[PDB]
Design a protein around this ligand. Sequence first.
Ligand code: HEM
Ligand code: HEM
Ligand SMILES: *[C@@H]1O[C@H](CO)[C@@H](O[C@@H]2O[C@H](CO)[C@@H](O[C@@H]3O[C@H](CO)[C@@H](O)[C@H](O)[C@H]3NC(C)=O)[C@H](O)[C@H]2NC(C)=O)[C@H](O)[C@H]1NC(C)=O
Ligand SMILES: *[C@@H]1O[C@H](CO)[C@@H](O[C@@H]2O[C@H](CO)[C@@H](O[C@@H]3O[C@H](CO)[C@@H](O)[C@H](O)[C@H]3NC(C)=O)[C@H](O)[C@H]2NC(C)=O)[C@H](O)[C@H]1NC(C)=O
Ligand SMILES: CCCCCCNC(=O)Oc1cccc(-c2ccc([C@H](C)C(=O)O)cc2F)c1
Ligand SMILES: CCCCCCNC(=O)Oc1cccc(-c2ccc([C@H](C)C(=O)O)cc2F)c1
Ligand SMILES: CCCCCCCCO[C@@H]1O[C@H](CO)[C@@H](O)[C@H](O)[C@H]1O
Ligand SMILES: CCCCCCCCO[C@@H]1O[C@H](CO)[C@@H](O)[C@H](O)[C@H]1O
Ligand SMILES: CCCCCCCCO[C@@H]1O[C@H](CO)[C@@H](O)[C@H](O)[C@H]1O
Ligand SMILES: CCCCCCCCO[C@@H]1O[C@H](CO)[C@@H](O)[C@H](O)[C@H]1O
Ligand SMILES: *[C@@H]1O[C@H](CO)[C@@H](O)[C@H](O)[C@H]1NC(C)=O
Ligand SMILES: *[C@@H]1O[C@H](CO)[C@@H](O)[C@H](O)[C@H]1NC(C)=O
Ligand SMILES: *[C@@H]1O[C@H](CO)[C@@H](O)[C@H](O)[C@H]1NC(C)=O
Ligand SMILES: *[C@@H]1O[C@H](CO)[C@@H](O)[C@H](O)[C@H]1NC(C)=O
Lengths: 557, 557
Amino acid sequence: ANPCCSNPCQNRGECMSTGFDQYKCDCTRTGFYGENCTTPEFLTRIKLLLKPTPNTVHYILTHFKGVWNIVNNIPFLRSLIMKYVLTSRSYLIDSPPTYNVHYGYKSWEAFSNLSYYTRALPPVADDCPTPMGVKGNKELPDSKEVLEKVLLRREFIPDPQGSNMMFAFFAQHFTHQFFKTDHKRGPGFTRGLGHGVDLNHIYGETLDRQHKLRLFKDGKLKYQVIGGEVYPPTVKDTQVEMIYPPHIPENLQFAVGQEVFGLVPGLMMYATIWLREHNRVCDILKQEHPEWGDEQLFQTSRLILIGETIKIVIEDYVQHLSGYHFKLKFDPELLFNQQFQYQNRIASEFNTLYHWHPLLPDTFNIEDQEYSFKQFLYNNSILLEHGLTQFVESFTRQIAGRVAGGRNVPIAVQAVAKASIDQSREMKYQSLNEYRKRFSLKPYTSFEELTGEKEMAAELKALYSDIDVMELYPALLVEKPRPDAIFGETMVELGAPFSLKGLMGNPICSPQYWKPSTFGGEVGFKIINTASIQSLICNNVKGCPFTSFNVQDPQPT
Amino acid sequence: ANPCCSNPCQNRGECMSTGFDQYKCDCTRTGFYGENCTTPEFLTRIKLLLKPTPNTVHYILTHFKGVWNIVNNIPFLRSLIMKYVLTSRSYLIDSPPTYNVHYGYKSWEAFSNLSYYTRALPPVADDCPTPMGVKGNKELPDSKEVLEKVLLRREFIPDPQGSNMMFAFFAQHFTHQFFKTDHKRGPGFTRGLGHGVDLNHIYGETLDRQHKLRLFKDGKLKYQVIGGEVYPPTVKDTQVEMIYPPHIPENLQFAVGQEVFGLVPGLMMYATIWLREHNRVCDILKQEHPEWGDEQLFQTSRLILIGETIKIVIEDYVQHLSGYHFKLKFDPELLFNQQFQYQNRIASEFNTLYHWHPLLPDTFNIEDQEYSFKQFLYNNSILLEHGLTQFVESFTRQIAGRVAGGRNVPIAVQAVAKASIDQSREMKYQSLNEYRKRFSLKPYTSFEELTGEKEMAAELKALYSDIDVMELYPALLVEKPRPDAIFGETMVELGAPFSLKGLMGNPICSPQYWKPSTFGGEVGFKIINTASIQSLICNNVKGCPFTSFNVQDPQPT
Ligand code: HEM
Ligand code: HEM
Ligand SMILES: *[C@@H]1O[C@H](CO)[C@@H](O[C@@H]2O[C@H](CO)[C@@H](O[C@@H]3O[C@H](CO)[C@@H](O)[C@H](O)[C@H]3NC(C)=O)[C@H](O)[C@H]2NC(C)=O)[C@H](O)[C@H]1NC(C)=O
Ligand SMILES: *[C@@H]1O[C@H](CO)[C@@H](O[C@@H]2O[C@H](CO)[C@@H](O[C@@H]3O[C@H](CO)[C@@H](O)[C@H](O)[C@H]3NC(C)=O)[C@H](O)[C@H]2NC(C)=O)[C@H](O)[C@H]1NC(C)=O
Ligand SMILES: CCCCCCNC(=O)Oc1cccc(-c2ccc([C@H](C)C(=O)O)cc2F)c1
Ligand SMILES: CCCCCCNC(=O)Oc1cccc(-c2ccc([C@H](C)C(=O)O)cc2F)c1
Ligand SMILES: CCCCCCCCO[C@@H]1O[C@H](CO)[C@@H](O)[C@H](O)[C@H]1O
Ligand SMILES: CCCCCCCCO[C@@H]1O[C@H](CO)[C@@H](O)[C@H](O)[C@H]1O
Ligand SMILES: CCCCCCCCO[C@@H]1O[C@H](CO)[C@@H](O)[C@H](O)[C@H]1O
Ligand SMILES: CCCCCCCCO[C@@H]1O[C@H](CO)[C@@H](O)[C@H](O)[C@H]1O
Ligand SMILES: *[C@@H]1O[C@H](CO)[C@@H](O)[C@H](O)[C@H]1NC(C)=O
Ligand SMILES: *[C@@H]1O[C@H](CO)[C@@H](O)[C@H](O)[C@H]1NC(C)=O
Ligand SMILES: *[C@@H]1O[C@H](CO)[C@@H](O)[C@H](O)[C@H]1NC(C)=O
Ligand SMILES: *[C@@H]1O[C@H](CO)[C@@H](O)[C@H](O)[C@H]1NC(C)=O
């Protein structure tokens, strides 16, 4: 019924009904005009003929290694390119945020209510004739059929880029501070009201939980030492709520910032490393500032650990998954002469695309054990039996699974994958091709073009009939990968804007925060600017073991 | 003990202790270097020799009327000047925000906890030898003595600029949506978590209160009609909490967005006008959009009323109090090619400086009655007896009191003025002269320079001894006024940055919001861009009475 159901407006123009059977497009600042915003302005058709495709740019960034080696050693050149990456990627994100699961038009409720995930594309209106708007059938294909035909793992497919379990569990640990769905309200809602990198997964979402986790001596978090090594405190000693099944011994009920981190030992490994790092930084600050009290030591260490996190995420984590020869840079100063909003709201679609469960292996291999999912889940005694050193040695050399390319969701978490499809529909997501247009990509014109193969393409065509009705989440996991890559085009071109905006939109990146005194002086500032995944593991894990996000990297002798 | 107690760092450099008896200043991006950040960079001393004083600029803006008449009719010139006003005023405000009453250093707690008012200058540390830091006595002068000697009204002093009760009650109504101190927590805390112009004073701070105030037909707010005219609903009909003394008849217990608006009929007059305006806009939108439901009509009318408010505040309200011949402009488009953060956090000092109780008259005169404070307070039957038309006619011609110039706080609210001094001390405010330096003003070198007279100056010198120990709040009210003006220098030069930043920092001013479709099309957009205090009263008060913020303005025949 809604005349905007067909999504007639292009190029980020906005649709508005103007009667029961009529619409108008608002083409303001789109670069286009005309009824559906498709006639380019003169300056726009020039930029269009000059702009290279994402696959062209990706080819360039992943070849000519010798030229990038030159560029990487010319600081002004490296800065210039990183600046463009930041600004061109951030422009794709609405900031201040706009739509959410209940509001397909801008409203004060959608702007001000922080309990919602925001939305990059508005939901399909309730009174539309079909799920995607006007295209398709009265119903989308059975989600269990989609799952089983093109999503479920047969044989484990490894990641050609070499991503390991250090990478997989870093992904899970990092993202779980800002993907925290509020299930009491629904899939369109979040419990992470900080909407970004605030490290609430280490410190607690609320003040009360934080104070239970703190020692109130020297800025430190509470801890215990077992077999000479430092671990989180227990729930019995702190009274912090954690999710643990009934049979776990009290001594194994570790209490950390995020209540669900007892779920797997891989999460608890990173929780332990960052706990140790917080207390390490406290001791360094206390040496510089014998005059400081506990509160300032705590707050300043937290700011430093936020900086470390963003530094590592950009220069090690995103660096690895990008596959680029260009050396990415964490440098807030790059945006001080640019237009940029230091704020962020977590988008629902960002959460959806980050469901990388194909990363998970068939078994978790530590030392000479091959733990099944049943044995690994909620078993912190595995963590104590082997210790972190052994964990790092094993996870560094265990390959993760490929995310794009299809048929690699492990059957142990199939219910989560089915839920991803279902809840996506529940939240009235627009189609894959609408999302592609939203992020300046060419719509796919067939399923074979989407997957780059024949067999899954044929399954999908039988289930969906029209490529314009294909859904976002299953498309991301069956998409044709880039050459020898873990992801396809749609994953990179949607994820990068959310990512970079999320990272640089943090207040510590703003001019009034980004200065030595914020972090306790040059010593604290330097901890941020020299941080790396290797130095994080080196400083806080016994023996300073070698690590990396890539199984292919040789350990030196 | 804290080596930063003397506030050694100048020019917005930040002080940090580096041991028990040593400090370092961080001069990053200040324009200065050296130990206390006082050696200007080459580009800085040039700008310094060229910059005109605030009193010089104010003279220019309030003379040469004939030249401004020319400038005002050259749109590109008017735009150019208004743009500079916005950017140069906004630069004075830390955004993202920094300090608060508990944090004299940057911290994630001060950034993320929206229950605090933010702070333009950090609090004096707890372990400082004196209240102001190092200067002064062990104690500040008795606040009751300060109050009685230089603050309390003897004879009513009228405002030379002609501000009337329409102006006074607009000030109280408008500001009370973002000055809402949380007394359960303390003077450094707020209940207005929107931190700006969200119109929570009409719609309610929470979703629950909002839904009790809504009709859920046509986007409208609940209402009743008495003697042919529209008034807010009752608490009995809505169950909305309001503050009312025990004896008020249920039929006179009007329920509006802000719970304290039953306090005076002047507040309830504006609450009634804006209630009528919301429902007026609903009917206009429903005519354009017969296909829209109640929720979209409600949300869109709210966005339109936010725009109207900012438009009126800038072009009528601030225009009047400024005294400028230059015609101020509400135009978000002026900032689209500038660096600007679309966000705002309400500062404690902004709240403090806006305590304009000298505005209040000795009696409130409506028709031929002269109501005392005792008779006026909580008496909504005064509102019904006379009606809004009569209220507008009387308040338009009743002069408000002068704010600067001293001795004009009415004795009916002296306890509020004493509390302002006390709570200011409680919140460990730095001195007047520190605040002046913070906003690029020359410190006063004597009390006579501050007041521009001899008698109050001598009282203050006996109470305070040193001008460097003079406090911010009493200084604002005794300060030498500009010629024939309601305020002194410190009030304008502190208030304008908070104001303009607060107004333009609203998300409806951002590029993705500021477009016709956000407001239901060109008809809704036009309601914002042609709004004025006269058209607000004309459209919603019976007979369309003449109004203005100035008693001096002639009504046409
Ligand atoms: C270690 C094994 C893992 C298991 C058993 C697991 C299982 C689950 C389950 C059951 C959920 C849904 C829980 C709920 O109802 O809220 C979930 C959510 C999620 N998982 Fe996994 N997961 C694992 C690892 C990972 C990894 C490696 C990633 C990659 C980033 C990941 C990303 C996510 C995301 C983004 C969510 C959504 C979280 C939210 O919205 O709150 N998980 N996982
Ligand atoms: C109509 C007569 C007025 C009365 C009886 C009055 C009385 C009061 C009182 C008693 C308070 C403190 C209440 C509390 O404990 O929170 C207060 C606060 C305040 N008043 Fe007035 N006032 C009046 C008008 C005005 C006017 C014209 C202004 C000018 C803007 C104004 C500005 C303020 C401000 C800014 C506050 C602080 C509010 C807060 O922090 O929550 N008031 N007023
Ligand atoms: C952000 O948006 C959320 C979604 O609209 C709001 O959550 C809704 O709050 C309603 C009350 O404010 C809840 O309804 C109430 O439920 C209780 C118990 O179930 C009843 O006693 C109430 O009568 C009932 N009222 C109504 C009108 O339904 C909703 O259940 C709840 N919705 C969801 C999906 O959780 C948030 O409150 C809002 N947050 C903020 C900060 O405004
Ligand atoms: C923003 O900052 C506020 C000031 O720090 C926080 O308010 C404080 O919350 C404490 C609990 O989180 C309150 O203390 C508790 O009071 C109750 C009852 O009085 C006791 O049961 C608790 O044991 C006690 N705990 C402690 C550690 O004191 C403080 O009274 C309260 N302070 C003030 C001034 O109100 C806000 O919680 C915080 N808001 C957010 C969103 O984090
Ligand atoms: C709220 C903070 C969120 C930050 C999440 C960081 N991103 C992340 O962890 O995973 C993701 C998820 C999806 C895409 C990306 C990503 C891929 C490529 C690039 C290169 C540099 C490019 O721009 O071309 C940048 C990216 F960011 C990262
Ligand atoms: C959160 C939103 C707050 C907005 C409050 C609006 N300001 C207000 O109502 O009162 C105030 C309070 C104090 C000063 C001013 C003010 C004075 C002069 C000027 C001119 C234009 C100049 O720049 O030179 C601008 C101003 F803003 C307004
Ligand atoms: C080749 C020199 C480095 C260029 C870095 C570009 C990084 C990402 O640039 C991206 O390119 C895409 C396709 O052009 C666009 O769709 C995105 O808007 C743009 O951000
Ligand atoms: C002149 C600058 C170098 C251009 C490099 C060739 C353009 C990129 O070649 C790319 O190859 C990919 C292989 O999977 C294809 O998927 C893309 O469609 C294609 O654009
Ligand atoms: C005279 C032409 C119009 C100029 C408008 C200036 C409006 C306010 O400009 C103010 O001037 C003050 C003194 O120079 C400075 O201290 C403030 O930073 C600046 O914002
Ligand atoms: C050359 C441009 C015109 C300059 C106008 C004269 C400078 C402003 O003259 C001002 O007069 C005020 C009167 O109260 C004084 O308080 C100020 O100190 C003074 O600067
Ligand atoms: C706009 O889109 C509609 C279908 O949604 C189409 O019928 C019409 O031709 C388009 N208008 C123009 C000018 O292309
Ligand atoms: C947990 O791991 C230990 C070995 O560390 C093993 O003995 C035990 O059976 C495991 N528990 C479960 C429930 O798998
Ligand atoms: C810095 O200020 C201190 C007093 O706080 C003063 O003693 C010192 O001389 C100043 N330093 C310089 C270089 O002016
Ligand atoms: C309220 O006003 C009415 C006149 O409108 C008057 O009769 C009454 O006495 C007033 N009440 C108080 C408590 O002053």
